[PDB]
Design a protein around this ligand. Structure first.
Ligand code: NA
Ligand code: NA
Lengths: 10, 98, 276
């Protein structure tokens, strides 16, 4: 299952 | 920019008359845009599938193109590959011993 | 064996040809099991292995919504990268990401991974401690500072030690009959005359899973690495892999050469020679 790391940005 | 490696080969050791799969494995390339055709006697095969685009530890991409075929003594098969790193499309002939 | 799970993200801009494409593929060991492609008519995380098909609608909905969000996040990341490298909007560029967990033979976390590349060059990597970053250049140092402020490593460490391991163990159990089955190579040596002076011995390994294998030629017991043509391990299309190693040998000297095959599907390392 994928990581929910939305809000991380370059 | 990294130019593709190309291997053309069969899923199983080839026997004239027996159904098999023709594989064209394209790897080591960057960027990701690439054109691959499987050729039978110089003509583009229509019923070709390919794996989902992925990449290796060194970030270079790879793809497998394949089609079902039945090798014969005289039919010539090949893979034609175009990539930004290539001035002209590259044709690699299927050699059943490679 | 030791098992791993990996997700691979690719975002590819293409000015003049629509918004950047975003793809995700997930692997357990050498088996791909999901894919997402923003170019699809109705983009969804979709199954690519039988043992994941049984996951319920909540699974597929969560994976899809995260991937659709990731499509937008990585288009923003591509715009950011242009500012970080003083690049124009006319060129094509690529961000790649891989992350996931490795399990030891005991089944516990061996190590975790999270790395990014920009245009095929390493950009930033989570260190093995899962708490510090290695930036490759001054652009990646800007990202590092942003990720230190947003506790990105902390979230990754939690995922990599917790959910990533737990999901991998679940997948390994559900796909036990394939994921936890090594297939040994079928091996042979072929002989291809070059001249009356020389011939190629080609040591084949076919039908093996997983892809990790070692093929080596020895001449009188001395490894022939610098004189061996070794093709890249290649997929057969039926989940297994193929590889060969070839040396050019003087005609009549073939019996001095031995091929050695190591693969985790084998009870013992194999030694072969040409059998005329
Ligand atoms: Na986050
Ligand atoms: Na570039």
């Amino acid at each position: 299952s994928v990581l929910n790391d939305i809000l991380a940005r370059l | 920019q990294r130019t593709p490696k190309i291997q053309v080969y069969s899923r199983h050791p080839a026997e004239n008359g027996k159904s098999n799969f023709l594989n064209c494995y394209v790897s080591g390339f960057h960027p990701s845009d690439i054109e691959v055709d499987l050729l039978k006697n110089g003509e583009r095969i229509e019923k070709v599938e390919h794996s989902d685009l992925s990449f290796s530890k060194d970030w270079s991409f790879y793809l497998l193109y394949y089609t079902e075929f039945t090798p014969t003594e005289k039919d010539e098969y090949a893979c034609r590959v175009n990539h930004v790193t290539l001035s002209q499309p590259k044709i690699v002939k299927w050699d059943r011993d490679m | 064996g030791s098992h791993s799970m990996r997700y691979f993200y690719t975002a590819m801009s293409r000015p003049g040809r629509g918004e950047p494409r975003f793809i995700t593929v997930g692997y357990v060991d050498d088996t791909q099991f999901v894919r997402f492609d923003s170019d699809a008519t109705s983009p969804r995380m979709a199954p690519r292995a039988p043992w994941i098909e049984q996951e319920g609608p909540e699974y597929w909905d969560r994976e899809t919504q995260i991937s659709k969000t990731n499509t937008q996040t990585y288009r923003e990341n591509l715009r950011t990268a242009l500012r970080y490298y003083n690049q124009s909007e006319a060129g094509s560029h690529i961000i790649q990401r891989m992350y996931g967990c490795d399990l030891g033979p005991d089944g516990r976390l061996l190590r975790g991974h999270n790395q990014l590349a920009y245009d095929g060059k390493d950009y930033i990597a989570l260190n093995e401690d899962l708490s510090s970053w290695t930036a490759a250049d001054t652009a990646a140092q800007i990202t590092q500072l942003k990720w230190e402020a947003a506790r990105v490593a902390e979230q990754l460490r939690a995922y990599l030690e917790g959910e990533c391991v737990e999901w991998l163990r679940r997948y390994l159990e559900n796909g036990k009959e394939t994921l936890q089955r090594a297939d040994p190579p079928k091996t042979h040596v072929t002989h291809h005359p070059i001249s009356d002076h020389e011939a190629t011995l080609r040591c084949w390994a076919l039908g093996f899973y997983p892809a990790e294998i070692t093929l080596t030629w020895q001449r009188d017991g001395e490894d022939q690495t610098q004189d061996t043509e070794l093709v890249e391990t290649r997929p057969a299309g039926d989940r297994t892999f193929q590889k060969w190693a070839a040396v050019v040998v003087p005609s009549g000297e073939e019996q001095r050469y031995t091929c050695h095959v190591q693969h985790e599907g084998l009870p013992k390392p194999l030694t072969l020679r040409w059998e005329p």
